[model samples]
Target chain A: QVQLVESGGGLVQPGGSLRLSCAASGFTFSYYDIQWVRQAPGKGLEWVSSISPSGQSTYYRREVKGRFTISRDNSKNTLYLQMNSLRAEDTAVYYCARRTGREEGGWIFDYWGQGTLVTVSSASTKGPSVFPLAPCSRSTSESTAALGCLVKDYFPEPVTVSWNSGALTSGVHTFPAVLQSSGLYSLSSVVTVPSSSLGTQTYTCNVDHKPSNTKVDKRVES
Target chain B: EIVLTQSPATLSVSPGERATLSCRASRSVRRELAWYQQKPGQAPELLIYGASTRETGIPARFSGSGSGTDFTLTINSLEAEDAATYYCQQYRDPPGTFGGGTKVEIKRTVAAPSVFIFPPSDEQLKSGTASVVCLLNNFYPREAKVQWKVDNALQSGNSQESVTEQDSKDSTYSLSSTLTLSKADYEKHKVYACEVTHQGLSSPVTKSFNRGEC
Candidate 1:
């Protein structure tokens, strides 16, 4: 039931360094010890570091000894990971999790966020791009119809999407993003609406790249 | 590699009867088997998955059974709308495979129309122009088409078909089509044929009138 989002994960120049962020919420953030886990491309998980809410003790894996730093602001319920000497090999998906009581269970990481996609690239990174929003395709009419939109080439994990008609919120579902082999991402979110009831009604789709301060708008009618 | 084959190319069953369909796999597919039903218009709907678990909202009469490589999809006291194409699929391997579908059909029969061509009567032919009528009767369905052909080719003339009339007792329809042509047009071909087409007939119903028959 807790929330932990790893931020500033879009892209970093191969020799550059970045201060990634984690904002934990929905629970007593400072009452627990937090950990960072990373999964490289098609590889096993590697523990990066952990910091106790006491702000006194910090832990790092042997491999990341000096290249990584972990800290937090207890008042803000936030954590930070400063990674140095970024390289193409460091591109991975990072998950920030927490622990409350004694470590007697294997579910220490289960309370983590949806995670992030860290890309180390020479090419300039791109924010999420919204493709055309169109009708769900079919040869015949159906009981329920869907308006679909695709967000592609997003550098990181999730993208926020919204619809203006509110009617589409009837059974709305979003697919934030899927990690691609190219280190970029794409996903589809289709909103279900009653086909006959939608009768010439207009609807709008909005995509927000909060990290990059970008917003895209597209409109369509059913 | 797993290949699934569904038996019974067509299952002819009534609404009260239970239909049992079979699916056999070349090798084990574990519990990744799914069964689907597709009707005339809509997409295939999942009926059962994980070998035997019924999909949500599926009725209790529809069931999946068996394990490993052998499976059965049983419909108890099948409904009229249950007539559809049923498929078995294996999702355990890449290129998930589906079985050759078995189509379910409800047993039904329709009466074919009796077609007859009556040449112009003597008194009508005396006017030098006559009407040849094609009568279709005793068909269970609503409609049938009749066309006049001269020498195997459509003959252009005044062709009129009456509105369908049905017998209340037997629910049978009777219709008539008229072909009005000049005497010269009548003699212009070796034979004039009346072709009747209906849903009950697999082939066109043809009745021809030759000069000798006239």
Candidate 2:
């Protein structure tokens, strides 16, 4: 037994961005990865990202990269998705995804949300810009760790960020100086530590406001 | 962001009136999900997935068809054990989320938890007590209550207080009760308590705290 409803207006103005949301009931929020998909008027669906209650996002393909963003706070058990630099082609109905367990838990986008319509107008919402993906790696020794930060002179202001050593950083290490250019903020920092804890360590990459930092996206101990 | 809320975690249908459960999603989610059923102490089984698909082995009367984010869970005809709790889940991601929970009881409000209930506290009652207050926390619905007993005897004349819930945080309920006892009715060393009636378990939760003192 199930029913879902979404609210928001249709019709978007030229050169404006739109945002909408879907609400759920009869279920717990944190238990599912509420995802968002955009159906442009009558066009095919666009895959944005899959969000988790822990504020982790995974993008699909390279289609809408740098345009769509999604996040969630388990405290609220709600999903959030937003788009920037909207044009007429960007107007569409947005939906949430509720998936099931096939192999890995919350690994796919199977179910969905009701669609919320949003008409974009000529309003601007801008903040910091995040570096797409600069190559970086980490390594560890018995008592120390290191991170090889790189900028390639493509992104702007960069600050090296190093935390723990496991997924993002191989081991405990130190952060290095960051490089910058243009306006796109980019940086690489590595930190070194006493490799004391072995596992249970994490490293992060700090950007401005666009995104606080990038941590170990995924890790497998076994 | 969108917020979803489901109500009547438990329903009691006389095999006639329809049993309906509700789920609401807030702003971003579209209603591309399904429903499920879990028996006591068992893994949750899928009832309907992908918004309206009926799985095999399910009764024909069990149907789910909804649009957008607002959905319904209905049991057209009721069965004896059908009186258990029902939950809805999203199939969007792994570890798919679930609804709080609802129970379908035989009587409108007669049901029990599958497990046993434990006493929250143990204490005695004092004679000449004006009123006894019992607070039931960590429970849902906020409208149910079980009686307090001293040994095997029943305590009479109790009043229910308010029911308050906060959805902004986690899903939970808070219920309270107030009972009045006359000086003649109150007995020294008598058990004072608060009992909660549930539709799933056989026993109710009896809490005995600050009995004789206050």
Candidate 3:
């Protein structure tokens, strides 16, 4: 019955101060330690800091700089991780975890909140980071297959998506560039191609925006 | 005559996948090893002893493997019910030595799938027939080819029945293949293998288990 819900992370400027929250539920607020953890793109998970429930002590597991802090509010059963002088290297999905030292000894992870994705960029807006997911064969027919692509962390709207470098609008469909709670925009696109093209053709996904680094051209093989 | 060590201190594994908790000793402890799992606010419960022998009343999903100085406690299909800290002890001599505990926590991420082999249960052992499950889990690809190998031979040519389910939001798929035979025929086989070949993987994943596991 333990639960953790993370909030307050999204696109932010480099060197800015960031504060993220984790609202815990289904347990006593002041009974355990709430820890802040992070993982950068293609990196392993790292421990940042942890705050004691009774506000007695705080432990920083890793060197997250002296400008970092972990705090909690017992009334709301919420925990917060605040850091200043954020860098692009600090861009990661932040998770608030509950650790248990009551296991007849030292600490082990108990529960972790769903992560909050934070992107740190010097620009006010950034383009989407796209990756082509695996393709699925048509359930109704063997004549066609569907391709999947993910477009995430783009802002200021008006992004164009295409398949195989061509605007094949007929076979391609995209979910709305939905505004996330973090104020960033993201979407997913799918394209249906002939089953005969599975092994013979190379598929590519292109997401284009105004920024210099906002273009993603991903080539995928079946 | 040995020093025990547990690395990583904490292990973050995804739910529905396999989690391998490693224990190393400075010198060989032979088969004189024991493992324990501790939950929050509870006493450490003995899990396995004699290297690969699990204690009574433990689930079949909790298994122990390896020997000598290196041992691993493998949890198949890591679920929310099995999250805890695990410790290993060597009792080869007068004073038992224990490694620092390893925390088993769930990591929610998009990653490769793992294959696991589950043996028949006591209830299934009581029935006239026995069964085994080959689980291929948490992969993003919707298509895969699975095979059940009996001994060195492929039995799936005659028997390949399966079930596959996908998460609506994550688009990841979890699949299972089952093998059921007579109590007489199940005891005759030495190796039951599960082979999974998927588009995302470069090579097929094959895992094997024997009848002693039950």
TM-score of each: 0.43, 0.31, 0.43
lDDT of model 2 at position B165? 29
Q: Sort by TM-score, best first: what order?
A: 3, 1, 2
Per-residue CA lDDT of candidate 1, range A1-222, in tens?
A: 566777757678887888878787888887887877665654434457888878898977667778878999989888888889876888877767774324432222335544577877787646775554332233225565455455545754546777774445643445424554456665544555655756555667777766566887767532
**Residue A40 alpha-carbon offset, candidate 2, angstroms:** 38
Interface C-alpha RMSD after superposing true interface residues, each candidate, one decimal: 24.3, 24.1, 19.3
TM-score of chain A of 3: 0.62
Model 2 bad stretches (over 4 Å): A1-222, B92-95, B108-214
Off by over 4 Å in 3: A127-188, A191-222, B1-60, B64-71, B75-214
Number of the top candidate by TM-score? 3
Worst 10 residues of 1 chain A by lDDT: A101-110
- Cα lDDT tens digits, model 2, B130-177, are 344444433433346556665556765444343432111223343434
Q: Enumerate residue pairs that collide in model 1.
A: none
Comparing 1 with 3 on DockQ, the higher-scoring candidate is: 3
What lDDT is reached at residue A216 by model 1?
77
Estimate, for each residue in A193-221, the C-alpha lDDT of model 2 and write its tens digit: 34454455543444332122322221212
